[PDB]
Every structure is written in C-alpha cells, then in structure tokens.
Amino acid sequence: EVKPNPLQDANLCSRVFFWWLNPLFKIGHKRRLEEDDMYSVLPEDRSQHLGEELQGFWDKEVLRAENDAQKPSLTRAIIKCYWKSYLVLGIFTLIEESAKVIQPIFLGKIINYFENYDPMDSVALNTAYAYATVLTFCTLILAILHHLYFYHVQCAGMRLRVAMCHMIYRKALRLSNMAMGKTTTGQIVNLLSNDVNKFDQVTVFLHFLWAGPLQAIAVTALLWMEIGISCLAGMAVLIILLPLQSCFGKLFSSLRSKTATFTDARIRTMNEVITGIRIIKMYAWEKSFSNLITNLRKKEISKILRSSCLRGMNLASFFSASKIIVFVTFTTYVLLGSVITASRVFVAVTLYGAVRLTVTLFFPSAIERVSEAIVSIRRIQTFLLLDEISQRNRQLPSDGKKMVHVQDFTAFWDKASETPTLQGLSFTVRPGELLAVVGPVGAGKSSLLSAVLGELAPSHGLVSVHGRIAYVSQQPWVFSGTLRSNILFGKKYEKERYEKVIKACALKKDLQLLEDGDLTVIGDRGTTLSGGQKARVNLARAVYQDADIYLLDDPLSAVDAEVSRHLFELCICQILHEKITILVTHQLQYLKAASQILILKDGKMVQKGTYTEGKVGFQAYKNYFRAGAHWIVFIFLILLNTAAQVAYVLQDWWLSYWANKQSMLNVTVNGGGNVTEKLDLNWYLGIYSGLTVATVLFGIARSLLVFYVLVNSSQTLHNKMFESILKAPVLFFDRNPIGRILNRFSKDIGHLDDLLPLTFLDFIQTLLQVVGVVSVAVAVIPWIAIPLVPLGIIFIFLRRYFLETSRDVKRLESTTRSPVFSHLSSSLQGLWTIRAYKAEERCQELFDAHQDLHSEAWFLFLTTSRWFAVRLDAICAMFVIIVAFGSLILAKTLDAGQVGLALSYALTLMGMFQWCVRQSAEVENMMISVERVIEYTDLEKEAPWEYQKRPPPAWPHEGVIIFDNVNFMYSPGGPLVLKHLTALIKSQEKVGIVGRTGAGKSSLISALFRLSEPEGKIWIDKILTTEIGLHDLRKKMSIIPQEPVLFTGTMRKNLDPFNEHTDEELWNALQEVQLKETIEDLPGKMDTELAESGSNFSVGQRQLVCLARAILRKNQILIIDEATANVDPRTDELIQKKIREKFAHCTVLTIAHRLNTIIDSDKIMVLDSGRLKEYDEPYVLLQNKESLFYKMVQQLG
Ligand SMILES: C[C@@H]1CC[C@@]2(OC1)O[C@H]1C[C@H]3[C@@H]4CC=C5C[C@@H](OCCC(CO)CO)CC[C@]5(C)[C@H]4CC[C@]3(C)[C@H]1[C@@H]2C
Ligand SMILES: C[C@@H]1CC[C@@]2(OC1)O[C@H]1C[C@H]3[C@@H]4CC=C5C[C@@H](OCCC(CO)CO)CC[C@]5(C)[C@H]4CC[C@]3(C)[C@H]1[C@@H]2C
Ligand SMILES: C[C@@H]1CC[C@@]2(OC1)O[C@H]1C[C@H]3[C@@H]4CC=C5C[C@@H](OCCC(CO)CO)CC[C@]5(C)[C@H]4CC[C@]3(C)[C@H]1[C@@H]2C
Ligand SMILES: C[C@@H]1CC[C@@]2(OC1)O[C@H]1C[C@H]3[C@@H]4CC=C5C[C@@H](OCCC(CO)CO)CC[C@]5(C)[C@H]4CC[C@]3(C)[C@H]1[C@@H]2C
Ligand SMILES: C[C@@H]1CC[C@@]2(OC1)O[C@H]1C[C@H]3[C@@H]4CC=C5C[C@@H](OCCC(CO)CO)CC[C@]5(C)[C@H]4CC[C@]3(C)[C@H]1[C@@H]2C
Ligand SMILES: C[C@@H]1CC[C@@]2(OC1)O[C@H]1C[C@H]3[C@@H]4CC=C5C[C@@H](OCCC(CO)CO)CC[C@]5(C)[C@H]4CC[C@]3(C)[C@H]1[C@@H]2C
Ligand SMILES: C[C@@H]1CC[C@@]2(OC1)O[C@H]1C[C@H]3[C@@H]4CC=C5C[C@@H](OCCC(CO)CO)CC[C@]5(C)[C@H]4CC[C@]3(C)[C@H]1[C@@H]2C
Ligand SMILES: C[C@@H]1CC[C@@]2(OC1)O[C@H]1C[C@H]3[C@@H]4CC=C5C[C@@H](OCCC(CO)CO)CC[C@]5(C)[C@H]4CC[C@]3(C)[C@H]1[C@@H]2C
Ligand SMILES: C[C@@H]1CC[C@@]2(OC1)O[C@H]1C[C@H]3[C@@H]4CC=C5C[C@@H](OCCC(CO)CO)CC[C@]5(C)[C@H]4CC[C@]3(C)[C@H]1[C@@H]2C
Ligand SMILES: C[C@@H]1CC[C@@]2(OC1)O[C@H]1C[C@H]3[C@@H]4CC=C5C[C@@H](OCCC(CO)CO)CC[C@]5(C)[C@H]4CC[C@]3(C)[C@H]1[C@@H]2C
Ligand SMILES: C[C@@H]1CC[C@@]2(OC1)O[C@H]1C[C@H]3[C@@H]4CC=C5C[C@@H](OCCC(CO)CO)CC[C@]5(C)[C@H]4CC[C@]3(C)[C@H]1[C@@H]2C
Ligand SMILES: C[C@@H]1CC[C@@]2(OC1)O[C@H]1C[C@H]3[C@@H]4CC=C5C[C@@H](OCCC(CO)CO)CC[C@]5(C)[C@H]4CC[C@]3(C)[C@H]1[C@@H]2C
Ligand SMILES: C[C@@H]1CC[C@@]2(OC1)O[C@H]1C[C@H]3[C@@H]4CC=C5C[C@@H](OCCC(CO)CO)CC[C@]5(C)[C@H]4CC[C@]3(C)[C@H]1[C@@H]2C
Ligand SMILES: C[C@@H]1CC[C@@]2(OC1)O[C@H]1C[C@H]3[C@@H]4CC=C5C[C@@H](OCCC(CO)CO)CC[C@]5(C)[C@H]4CC[C@]3(C)[C@H]1[C@@H]2C
Ligand SMILES: CN(Cc1cnc2nc(N)nc(N)c2n1)c1ccc(C(=O)N[C@@H](CCC(=O)O)C(=O)O)cc1
Ligand SMILES: Nc1ncnc2c1ncn2[C@@H]1O[C@H](COP(=O)(O)OP(=O)(O)NP(=O)(O)O)[C@@H](O)[C@H]1O
Ligand SMILES: CCCCCCCCCCCCCCCC(=O)O
Ligand SMILES: [Mg+2]
C-alpha cells in the first residue's frame, strides 16, 4: 500500500513520545505535503470494519427492542459497542486525577522543609530532595502521559464518527421513495457535515463526568486537612461560579440570536447590491442602499458591542476568579484566629487553582458537549429509524422470460393520495420483443421506468420482472472517479467493446475532447463530461455492461441522429437484439423506429395501436490597530494590561510577602510570641483586600477596553469597505465573481466581529499570565534566567518546525472532507440507477475509500497536534524541574514565601503555556481575514461623485453630446471597440444618443450614465463630460436594463427611493402607465414589502415600473439597453403609444433584433466591426439600394 503506518511497528517508547512521526515532519520541512506523503489508516480503523461492527451492534439492539417491544435506542448500541475500550482510558483518567491532586501535597512537604530551615540538618535536606524527586516524577507523568491518553481518547471519538458515517450511508442507499420526498438531500448532507462532528468532541471530556465531581470532593478533603472549615468557604465561591457564569452564557446566546437576524438582513442586501451592482450604479441609487446598509450596520454593531461586553466580562471574571477564591478563604482563615504560614497558604493556592480549572472549564464543557452529542444521537437515530423502503425485496426469479403485466394497478408515489397516477394500464410483455413508449410526459413515464418495482409496487397489479435492469434516468448522472469507472461502473475492462462504443456510439469525439485521453480521470462529481456525454454514458453503461432490460428516459433525444441510427442498426436491432428497449421519444425518427406506442393521461391506458393505426506582516497588525483607536489609547491599553497582570501577581505576592514577613515574624513574633506583634489585621487585611479588588477592577477594565477597541476597529473597517466597494469600477465586479465579494463581506467580517476579538483578548491575557509566571520564577531565583535562554530559543525553533508542517496537514484535511459529502450527494442524485444496477456494494466501497482517505487526514492531524503538545509540555516540565531543584540546591538565600510562590506558579505554567501557544496559532491563522479586508479596503476607486464643476441647475439645456476621436479601451489593456464615433443630439430635445455593445452603449453611459472609459473628446451640452462628477452626471439619464431587476424593500422605495415625487404624482403616474389596477390589489398598497427580488411583479410589470420611475423622474432622455425588443407585446403596443404621448416626456432610442421595433425609429446607427460607417435615417437604408441595411435585411433578416 502507501507507506505503512509506523504506529503498527512502533514500540512503547516511540508511541508515548510520538517518535515515529519524526520522518514525516522531515519531508514536511523539505517540501509541500501531498496525499501521497500520507499514512494509511490502521487495519482496525478501516471504515468498513467499524461500519460492520456497529451494524452488528445496532442490528442486535433493534432485534432486542423488537423482542421487548420498545423504541430502539442508538445510545444503548453505542455504549454496548465502545464501553470496554473506554473504561480502560477512564482508568488512566483516574491516574491523572490522582497525580494532579497529590502534587500539591509534596509541594507542601518541600515548603514545610523551607519553613523549618536548619543548615546543619543533612537528613532534612535529603528528605526534601526525595520530596522534590517525587514532585518531578508526578509532573512528568502528568506531561507525557496525559498526552498519550488524550490521543487515544480522540482516536476513540474518530472511530465513532467514522462508524456513524458508514451507518448513515448504508441507510441512505436503502432509503425509500416517499421517505426521499419527506427528507430532502440537504438534511442528509447536513447530517454528515455538522451533526456527526459532535462525536469528535464529546469523547474528549466524557470521562470528566465522573472525574470532575470526584476530584473536587478529594480536593475539598485535602483542603480541610490543611486549613479546616475555612477551606469550605473558598469552595463555596467556586460552586457559585458554576451557575452564574452559565446563566450569563444563556443571556449571551439570546443576544447572539438578535445579531444573527440583522446580519442576515444585511447580507441579503449585500447580495442584492453585488449581483445587481451594474443596475445600482446605472440608476444613481447609491444613496438609498448606502443609508440602508448604514442603519443595518449601526444596529448590528450595537448588538455586537453588548454581546462583546458580556463576553469580556466573562473573561475578566475567570481571570480574577482565583484571587477572589483565595481572598475569601484566607480572610475567613485569618478572621477565625489562625496564623498563616507559607506551606499551608501555597498548598491551598495550588489545590484551589487545580480544582477551579477543572470545575469551571472541563465539567461545564463536558456537560455541554454531552448534551450536544445527545441531541445529535437523537437526530441521527430518528434518521436511522427513518422509514426505509418497505423492504426492498431481492428481485423475483429472473427465469429467462420477460413476462411483465399490469392489470388495474392503483399504487403511486404516495399511496394515501386518491388521485390516480397510473391504472387502466394493462398489458403483457413477452421475452425478446422490442417495445418503445412514446408520448407526452403525462404522469407516468417515470412509473414505467420504475416498473422495476421502483416506486410502483403493485397494490393490485402483478409484474414478474425477470432479467437484469439497465435504467437511464431523465437527468443522467456521473459519479466521482475515473472515466473508466463511470463508463465501466464496476465492469471489467473490455477493450474491444470499449472500442465498439467509441466507434458505433461515436465516443471518439470525447476521446479527443478529454485532456488526458483514455486514462482521463473523471473530474469531481463527474464534471469532465457534458450532457450528451452523461446521457450517452448512461446508455453506454447499459449496453456495454451487457444488461438484459433497458429502461431509457429519452436518451436518444439528447444525442444526435448519427449515434441513434448506429444504435438501432448495430445495437437495438443487432447488439440489443434480445434486450428491453423502453424509449420515450418526440422526434419523427425514434417514433418510426418503434413498433408499439403507449400514450398516457391520468391513469387509464387509452390505447395500444401500431404505426399505420503565509504570515501577516507588521503592516497588517499596525493597520488593524490604528484602525482601532489612537495610539494614545493603545499606550493606555498596554499600561492597563501591565497593571492588571502586576496586580494579579502582587495579590499572591502579598500573600507570599505576608508569608516571608511572617517567616521572619515567626522567628521573632511567633516563637518569641510573648511580645505578640499581632499582625495588624486592619493594615494587612486592607492591603490584601485592596490588591484583590484592584486585580478584579483592572482585569474587567482591560477586557472591556480590548473588546471595545477591537470592535470599533471592525466597525470602521466595515464602513470603509462598503464606501470603497460602492465606488469600485464595474471592472472589479466583472473580474471578481459575486460569490467572492459576498464571502469577503460575510465570513471575514463575521470573524472580525465575533472570533478575532475574543481570541486576541484571550491570547493576550494568557501570554501575560505566562510572562508573570516566568518573571516570578526569575525574580525568586535569578540564576533561573541562565537555563531559560536556551529553552525558550528551542521553543521558537520547535514552533516553526511544527507550523511549517501543521498548516499543510490542516489544509489537506479540508480538501479531503468535501469529497465525502459530494459522494453522498452523488448517491442521492442517482439512487434509482444505483438500485437498478444492484451496485450497492460498489458504492459502499467507494464511500469507504473516501472516508478512509479522510481518516488518514484526521489521524495525521490528531497525531501531529499531539506531537507538538508533547514537546511543549516536556519543555514546561523541564522548567518545573529546574525551578524546584535550583530552589533546593541553594535554599540559603531563599525563604519560604518566595519558594512557595515560585513553585506554585511553575506548577501552573503548563496549562497556561499550552493555551497561549494554541491561541497564538489560531490568531495568526485567522488574521488572513484581516489581510483580505485591508485588501478590499484599498482597491482602486473611480472619480468622485461631484468634482468642482457643479453646473447651475436646469443643466440639460441642450442634451448635445458628441464624440471626437475616441479610441475605446473596454478594459485597460483590452480590445478596441469604438474609434471616432461622431453622433449629433440637438438642444432641449426629446432626442437621444445610443451605441450598442455593453461598452459602446456604455460609452454613451460614460458620457452620461458613467460606466465605461472612453478616451476621446466628448461634448455633453457643449461641455466635456469629464468635468462633471459621477452622480451629477448620472442624474439626468433614464434607462431600462435587459432584465429590469427588482430590489427587496418597501414598494415605496422601489418606485422612488429618493422621494422626489408627491403622492398624487405616483397615483396618477401609475394610472397613466396603467399599473394601478395591479398595484391597488397589492396588500401593501404603496409601502408593500416585495418578495425575493420582486417575485410578485411580472417581468412586464418590472420593465413597466422602471419606465414609470423614469416618467416620475421626468428626464429628457432614456436609453433602452437593447430592450425595445425584449418587450412583452402588450407593452410593445404600450411603448409605441408611450413614445407617441406617454414617454413623450422621455426620449427612447430603439436598437434591437426585433425589426418591427426598429422600423419606427427615426435614426439607425449602422456599425461594422463595431464602427459607424454610415449615419442617416432608416428609410433610405431599408430598401434594396443600400449597403449594410440591405445585408441585414437579406442574410440577417
Ligand atoms: C504516587 C505515590 C503516592 C505515595 C508515595 O509514592 C508515590 O509517595 C511517596 C512519598 C515517599 C516518602 C518520601 C520521603 C521519604 C524520606 C526518605 O529519606 C530516606 C532517609 C535515609 C536516606 O536514604 C537516611 O538519611 C525515606 C523514604 C520516605 C519516607 C518516602 C517513603 C515512600 C513514600 C511515602 C512514597 C509513597 C508510597
Ligand atoms: C459537602 C461537601 C462534600 C463532603 C465534604 O466536603 C464538603 O464534607 C466535609 C465534611 C468533612 C469532615 C467533617 C468533620 C471532620 C472532623 C475533623 O476532626 C475530628 C477528627 C476525629 C473525628 O472522628 C477523628 O478523625 C477531621 C476532619 C473531618 C473528618 C472532615 C473531613 C472532610 C470532610 C469529610 C468534608 C467532605 C470532603
Ligand atoms: C454555603 C455556605 C457559604 C459559606 C459558609 O458555609 C457554606 O462558610 C462557613 C464558614 C462558617 C464559619 C466557620 C467557623 C466557625 C466556627 C465557630 O466559631 C469558632 C468557635 C470556637 C471553636 O473552637 C472558637 O474557635 C462558630 C461558627 C463559625 C464562625 C462558622 C459560621 C458559619 C460559616 C460562616 C459558614 C458559611 C455559612
Ligand atoms: C464564600 C461566600 C463569600 C461570602 C462569605 O460566605 C459565602 O464569606 C464568609 C466570610 C465570613 C466571615 C469570616 C470570619 C468571621 C469572623 C468571626 O468573628 C469571630 C472571630 C473570633 C476569632 O477570630 C473572635 O475574634 C465571625 C464570623 C465572620 C464575620 C464570618 C461571617 C460570615 C462570612 C462573612 C461569610 C460570607 C457570607
Ligand atoms: C454532581 C453529581 C455527580 C455527577 C452527576 O450527578 C450529580 O452530574 C450530573 C450531570 C448529568 C448529565 C448532565 C446533562 C445531561 C444531558 C441530557 O440530555 C439532553 C436532554 C435535553 C436536551 O434538550 C432534553 O431533551 C441527558 C442527561 C445528562 C446526560 C445528565 C446525565 C446525568 C449526569 C451525568 C449527572 C451525574 C451522575
Ligand atoms: C518591566 C519593568 C522592568 C523594571 C521594573 O519593573 C518592571 O522591575 C521592577 C523591579 C523593582 C525593584 C525590586 C526590588 C527592589 C529592592 C528595594 O531596594 C532596596 C530598598 C531599601 C533601601 O531603600 C529598603 O530599606 C526596593 C526597590 C527595588 C530596587 C525595586 C525598584 C523598582 C524595580 C526596579 C521595578 C522596575 C520598574
Ligand atoms: C509583565 C509583568 C510586569 C511586572 C512583573 O512581571 C512581569 O515584574 C516582576 C517584578 C517582580 C518582583 C521583583 C522582586 C521581588 C523581590 C523578591 O525577593 C527578593 C529577595 C532577594 C534576596 O536575596 C532575592 O533572593 C520577591 C519577589 C518580587 C516581589 C517579585 C515578584 C514578581 C514581580 C512583581 C513581577 C511582576 C509581575
Ligand atoms: C510598573 C510597576 C508597578 C509595580 C512595581 O514595579 C513597577 O513597583 C515596584 C515596587 C516594588 C517593591 C519595592 C520595595 C520592596 C521592599 C522589599 O523589602 C525589603 C525588606 C528589608 C530587606 O533588608 C528592607 O531592609 C521587598 C520588595 C518590595 C516590597 C518590592 C516588591 C515589588 C514592587 C511592588 C514592584 C512592582 C512590580
Ligand atoms: C501597585 C501596588 C501598590 C504598592 C504596593 O504594592 C503594589 O507596593 C508594595 C510595597 C510594600 C511595602 C514594602 C516595604 C515596607 C516595609 C516597612 O516599611 C516601614 C517604613 C516606615 C516605618 O519604619 C518608614 O517611616 C513597612 C511595610 C512596607 C511599607 C510595605 C507595605 C506594603 C507595600 C507598600 C505594597 C503596596 C501594596
Ligand atoms: C484601590 C481601591 C481603593 C480603596 C481600597 O481598595 C480599593 O484601598 C485599600 C487600601 C486600604 C487601607 C490601607 C491602609 C490602612 C491603614 C490602617 O491603619 C493605619 C494606621 C497607621 C499606620 O500604621 C496610620 O498612621 C487602617 C486600614 C487602612 C486605612 C486600609 C483600609 C482599607 C483600604 C482603604 C482599601 C480599600 C478597599
Ligand atoms: C494597590 C492598592 C491601591 C493602592 C494601595 O492599596 C492597594 O497600595 C498601598 C500603598 C501604600 C503606601 C505605600 C508606602 C507606605 C510607607 C510606609 O511607611 C511610611 C508611613 C509612615 C508615616 O509617614 C508610618 O508608617 C507605610 C505607609 C505607606 C504610606 C502606605 C500606605 C497605604 C498605601 C497608600 C496603599 C494604597 C491605598
Ligand atoms: C516582563 C519582564 C520579565 C523579566 C523581568 O522584568 C519583567 O523581571 C524582573 C525581575 C527583576 C529582578 C527582581 C529583583 C532584583 C533584586 C535586586 O537587588 C539588588 C540588591 C543590591 C545587590 O545588587 C543592589 O546593589 C537586584 C535586581 C533584581 C535581581 C531584578 C533584576 C531585573 C529583573 C530580573 C526583571 C526582569 C527584566
Ligand atoms: C545573563 C544573566 C543575567 C543575570 C545573571 O546571570 C547572567 O547576572 C549575574 C550577575 C550576578 C550578581 C553579580 C554580583 C553579585 C554580588 C555578590 O556579592 C558578593 C560579592 C563577592 C562574592 O562574589 C565579590 O567577590 C552577591 C551576588 C551578586 C548580586 C550576583 C547575583 C547573581 C547575578 C545577578 C547573576 C544572574 C543570574
Ligand atoms: C525538546 C526536544 C529537543 C529535540 C527536538 O524537539 C524538542 O528539537 C527540535 C529542533 C529540530 C531541529 C531544528 C533544525 C534543524 C535544521 C537542520 O540542521 C541544521 C544543522 C546546523 C544548525 O546549526 C548545524 O548543526 C536539520 C534538522 C534540524 C536539526 C531539526 C531536527 C529535529 C529537531 C532536533 C527537533 C527535535 C525533535
Ligand atoms: C487556563 N486557560 C485559560 C482560559 C481562557 N479563557 C477562558 N474562558 C473561560 N470562559 N473560562 C476559562 N476557564 C478560560 N480559561 C485555559 C486552560 C485550559 C483550556 C483547555 O480547555 N484545553 C487545552 C486544549 C483543549 C481545547 O480547549 O481545545 C489547552 O490548550 O489548555 C483552555 C483555557
Ligand atoms: N418524485 C415524484 N413524486 C411524485 N410523483 C412523481 C415524481 N416524479 C414523477 N412523478 C409523477 O410523474 C409525473 C411526471 O411525468 P413522467 O412520467 O416523469 O414523464 P417523463 O418521464 O418526464 N416523460 P419525457 O420527458 O417525455 O421523457 C409527475 O407529474 C407525477 O405524476
Ligand atoms: C510565550 C509564547 C509566545 C508565542 C508567540 C509567537 C512568537 C513567534 C515568533 C516568531 C514568529 C514567526 C517567525 C517566522 C516563521 C513563520 O512563518 O511562522
Ligand atoms: Mg417519467
């Protein structure tokens, strides 16, 4: 196979340290990874194996439920399948919990040694060394073993996901027709896409369901044994932290919902602006959409700011939660009359930190993921119990005959429907005869196709279909694979028959067309073909695959007569000599190749007659931030962050200093306790309370400020983007697909509004916490700086060596995930022919291969992530060992408080470091959206809407426009389309100027509607067109598009978005233009909210309302962008009467392919190669004596 998984031959040490992954990274560092550089899935992880095992378990569960007469449970089957393999990992989770719980005990033993320091006690030093050895043993167990266990847990989750997908596909291939109608293909694709990924997550935290509450209990016990009932107080706060935060989360969700609605609305308008941007710029309607989007964005940014404030409050609350817990518990401790010591204080601090992280991060996450997985299992289960075809029976004996007969069959697509689709049909088919049903679609040719017991199971009829069915559908379908596979469809390669189809079936054209040849791989979803090829290849599969019964829904209609005649002589008469030839047709040639004709209506068979009857630079970050706020604000922000972290560390430093001062104090004030230098509770307690209050306040302020500045940056960037895009040239929209721009406006902006601020704030917070831990350790033991310089350096290199590969693997997993869904989708389009060919196992194997490839991707992703995690935690464990033992080596220059503080922070460095590195990677990956946003933010814009000119009103005094040696450039650096066009429009005249091409007539538009870029001297109103701004130029030009599109919003906004017409004006304007009978009946009257792009208005009414807007607009000219021809005839007679008296107020120029629309026009601009050779009236031109007019009259018609 491919390079076999080294995990098979990997020994225990290599598997724990992921040593076997080393070669891959090497190649991952040498070049770019592909699918060939991949590792095959393990034999026990193959999709077929897991699918079969879960099939057995689920079938057993179904049988048990049926025996005991209750609804079967999928959760029961999943548990009964994976519980043995999961409880062992729960064993390891017990071990991990025990190590995490008992590490602070040995921390307290070392600190107690420091508390009772005696330089002459060697035995105490040896005991402390042994305690440090046990502590580092525990942290290595925690470091390299939680990661091996985590990889196994994630592998279990991936196994569950793969088995579930195999289950779903196996069910889908056996789904029913009416069930297919009940459930859409989108629902099933969604099941494979987002509803099954939850199983990849729940398994991560499932064991915590019993690990969290238990560990918590244990911690409480230990805490009691240290400080008694006071510990409970701290625990109480932790408990309070569980509901309240969850409660706020609920509120969070609510706010999110509201924002969603606004976003959708905005996005809708976004689509409506980008798809019809040409029209928006054509009509000079930019102000209306601009203000509408401004209002929508303002509301959205208000709701997003509220949600961001809530999330920032949550982050600040968790950041300061440890201090609140410690402050409460130790204030209770001191106020009860006790005296604090470094050992007990820092044991309590470490235990509280561990238990708080567990209880407040893993347990609620475990509950949330379990609930999501439960609802997903419920949905997937109700799909697996979705009614399947009432059991599709293996076909009845194909005993050499072709005896089929239908006698008063009343069974349809939906049995409950009383309206007959097919019945009356009562005939008998004999072996070898050729039949061919021909006639109108009717209501049952599909039933004759499905007469293979597809969807017409006989309620009263009885059809003995014998033989092998070759079904061809209305829409031919081509599956994912190689052209050999689609032609072959499981059949063995037969060269001569393949040649036979290439000659008789005339596929040599396709051989020529394919870019690779006879080895050409069918593209994804089989696109490397055309409709003729898919229909022909369906018939080709049937005839090559030498089936017996051939059901063809008009495949010879699509193909040409040559191939059709070839298959009658060669195939239908000779090769398909003893095959069923059900062929619907409408030409006269397959009508005359047939022997029997079937014509159908609702049910009753009328007759049976015969014939004669990579990274983002500092510029990106700088522009994002300076887009956020003034650099003074950023100086204030970094000062606030530093103050917050300083207060966070100093709250514990105050406890440590109390301990250090307390150590000197124990020496004189405790042992020599007669003087009773009682600690001034007011003084000491006040500084402690002030420090913790300052920590809380500074954390809250920093979180709020970061969120506010980032959200403000997002809002300014979005506003700038809309303003910039609104001024984008039509060239940008022509070059860039609509989907690309819509995606840039939707996904990146959603990122910048939701994910980027939160991730950036979390990364900054965690990085500051890590820096605080490192600085505490360095401050306590300065020599710790010496080994820290190499370690960090190594980390940097390591990071690169991972990322350079990691991104690639991630990219690979993205490109390997969409094929699976497409194959499922492919199965859904052609399920009929899949069941027709009895090819369920082949499609199952193809889906299994697609899933196995994606399983390779997912396995690589999990394993590489664990490799990096193992090395990072090894670095952190090395740091903890270094701190604890360098503390032990000297000890002379250190006291209990400093050692306790430093060790507790080293004991917390691990999780924080993991969070910070992964979050930094996430931020760096997500900043590509910011890069794209800045790219759109600075695209080239056109001339300003108003320049300086500003003509006096009543401007279109003359309406005279001329062109004077213009050399047209359609696109900069493109072809030449107009060279010295010299038209003449008189003053104060109901006369117009029109060109023809989307760029020649747009040249006219550049002169007035402003959409192309003519070079030549242009005289509008005896003033050059150039000096007039965009809108001040766009204002006096009325126009009708090829497709008079309609925009979502009120009816009032569509008729007049600028509100320049008084109400009785719209009333009498629509009655004069006769739309009033249509609009009076509209429920919204004038302010009717239109449907999706004006669905209710007819196309005749859409052109009518655009001409009507122009009429209220009261311009003197109007351009019909080749629209006098694509006019509905009531409108044609109408528009003739219009330019006689109704558009009398607007000038129409009729350029068209409908000659009747142009004979009436006063002037015709004849153009060859896009050039005006002759310019005079049509009447001289229309007769025979004329050059080009006579050519269009002759040849063009
Ligand atoms: C995960 C597990 C949790 C429980 C547990 O294991 C790991 O935690 C360990 C702590 C250990 C003690 C630590 C300190 C010393 C001092 C040392 O001093 C020798 C002095 C001599 C020089 O050799 C003369 O100077 C003798 C041994 C002793 C008492 C350990 C005994 C075993 C203990 C109890 C272990 C216990 C089974
Ligand atoms: C509700 C939450 C879940 C359960 C739990 O947390 C809170 O509820 C707490 C009750 C605590 C015990 C109450 C009283 C004492 C007596 C004391 O002094 C006398 C000693 C002498 C008595 O016979 C000889 O042992 C020693 C400690 C002990 C046993 C407590 C231990 C911790 C315990 C089990 C805590 C436990 C983890
Ligand atoms: C959900 C709940 C939130 C918080 C809470 O429980 C859980 O946290 C507990 C802490 C308790 C105090 C701890 C110790 C004592 C002992 C005794 O005073 C010493 C007497 C004598 C002994 O030798 C001289 O030392 C009297 C009672 C007192 C003050 C407790 C009162 C109730 C308190 C405040 C509890 C409070 C309701
Ligand atoms: C965990 C949650 C956060 C809020 C809270 O619990 C829930 O946190 C607890 C702190 C408790 C106080 C701690 C200490 C004392 C001193 C004692 O005085 C006799 C001392 C004696 C020897 O020192 C003679 O001097 C009387 C009781 C009192 C005031 C407690 C009252 C209840 C308080 C306020 C609790 C409060 C409701
Ligand atoms: C602290 C004590 C020790 C531990 C423990 O007890 C208390 O903590 C509890 C957490 C409980 C689960 C939390 C959430 C759910 C989801 C729900 O599914 C959605 C259904 C809904 C969707 O809309 C309605 O349809 C099903 C129940 C389940 C899995 C709980 C199971 C029992 C559990 C494991 C309990 C466990 C024994
Ligand atoms: C990012 C920033 C880099 C620099 C910096 O912050 C973070 O690093 C901090 C460390 C601080 C010192 C720590 C300990 C002491 C000892 C004591 O000196 C004798 C006192 C004696 C005679 O007065 C008493 O009897 C007090 C002062 C001193 C030197 C601190 C000074 C400020 C310093 C330099 C801070 C400085 C602004
Ligand atoms: C981004 C953040 C900006 C600020 C910050 O981090 C990064 O900068 C660090 C400065 C550190 C203190 C410097 C000096 C000491 C003295 C030491 O004792 C000396 C005794 C001596 C006798 O020989 C040596 O042995 C005890 C600790 C303490 C107070 C430090 C605590 C942590 C502090 C506050 C850190 C603080 C959080
Ligand atoms: C921008 C940042 C704002 C905060 C901050 O930096 C800059 O401001 C600094 C002030 C520092 C303290 C100055 C003096 C002392 C006294 C010393 O006690 C000697 C006892 C005895 C020995 O002989 C005397 O004779 C212990 C250390 C301590 C408390 C410093 C702690 C760290 C502090 C709080 C620093 C803190 C990180
Ligand atoms: C940002 C935060 C604000 C500032 C702050 O944290 C950071 O900085 C810390 C430094 C601490 C002081 C260090 C050393 C001394 C020793 C001794 O000095 C007696 C001198 C007096 C009598 O002889 C002369 O008249 C008494 C205690 C004192 C002043 C500490 C008190 C608490 C202080 C001010 C802490 C305070 C909360
Ligand atoms: C940052 C925010 C501002 C408010 C605040 O946090 C949040 O700031 C904290 C500082 C605390 C005070 C510090 C020092 C003392 C002196 C002591 O006695 C002195 C006697 C003698 C010297 O020995 C005088 O010369 C009495 C208590 C008192 C006033 C504290 C009270 C509580 C206070 C006000 C805290 C308060 C909650
Ligand atoms: C972070 C939170 C906000 C700020 C704050 O709380 C915590 O940080 C503390 C800094 C403290 C002062 C620093 C240095 C000393 C000198 C020393 O000795 C000289 C005084 C002498 C007479 O001149 C007699 O001691 C002790 C007193 C004093 C002035 C502190 C007072 C309390 C203050 C103002 C606290 C303040 C409210
Ligand atoms: C984000 C950054 C992480 C790293 C870092 O900043 C923040 O963390 C700070 C901790 C600082 C030390 C704290 C305490 C002291 C004691 C003092 O005692 C002199 C007494 C006498 C004998 O020399 C004077 O004559 C000497 C200096 C020293 C060791 C600091 C050095 C600078 C350090 C390492 C800082 C370092 C750049
Ligand atoms: C790149 C890294 C930056 C940090 C660091 O490494 C390199 O820079 C080093 C400088 C060292 C100090 C130098 C001088 C002295 C004087 C001495 O007083 C007795 C003097 C007597 C006997 O030496 C003369 O003969 C006490 C110790 C002290 C303060 C050192 C402490 C450790 C320090 C801070 C080291 C620290 C780990
Ligand atoms: C804690 C763990 C320690 C080991 C380890 O993980 C962490 O550290 C990682 C760093 C990786 C190396 C980075 C760069 C090079 C480049 C090139 O050699 C240049 C040679 C030239 C440079 O100066 C002269 O020597 C070839 C590859 C090599 C050596 C990488 C190999 C794999 C290494 C050793 C990884 C290894 C698994
Ligand atoms: C300490 N910390 C910081 C942090 C940041 N934001 C938070 N936000 C909230 N709401 N709650 C928290 N507890 C929290 N914690 C952590 C710790 C662990 C993980 C964690 O769940 N998992 C692994 C990786 C697993 C994963 O989440 O994908 C890690 O990187 O530490 C996340 C954040
Ligand atoms: N999915 C379906 N659900 C219900 N009824 C259906 C379905 N598909 C087809 N029908 C029935 O069949 C009718 C369509 O005519 P059909 O028998 O498919 O003609 P045809 O095969 O399209 N003929 P031609 O186009 O000339 O090859 C429908 O109007 C229904 O009566
Ligand atoms: C304490 C953890 C810090 C993590 C922050 C990331 C620091 C990365 C510094 C190097 C950036 C990348 C250098 C070029 C290589 C690349 O293309 O990624
Ligand atoms: Mg049909």
Swiss-Prot record:
Widely expressed, with particularly high levels in prostate, but is barely detectable in liver. sinusoidal membrane of hepatocytes. It is found in: Basolateral cell membrane; Apical cell membrane. One of its GO terms (biological process) is transmembrane transport. GO terms for molecular function: 15-hydroxyprostaglandin dehydrogenase (NAD+) activity; ABC-type bile acid transporter activity; ABC-type glutathione S-conjugate transporter activity; ABC-type transporter activity; ABC-type xenobiotic transporter activity; ATP binding; ATP hydrolysis activity; ATPase-coupled inorganic anion transmembrane transporter activity. Its main location: membrane. Changing residue 481 to E: Transport properties comparable to wild-type. ATP-dependent transporter of the ATP-binding cassette (ABC) family that actively extrudes physiological compounds and xenobiotics from cells. Transports a range of endogenous molecules that have a key role in cellular communication and signaling, including cyclic nucleotides such as cyclic AMP (cAMP) and cyclic GMP (cGMP), bile acids, steroid conjugates, urate, and prostaglandins. Mediates the ATP-dependent efflux of glutathione conjugates such as leukotriene C4 (LTC4) and leukotriene B4 (LTB4) too. This is ATP-binding cassette sub-family C member 4. It comes from Homo sapiens. The gene is ABCC4.
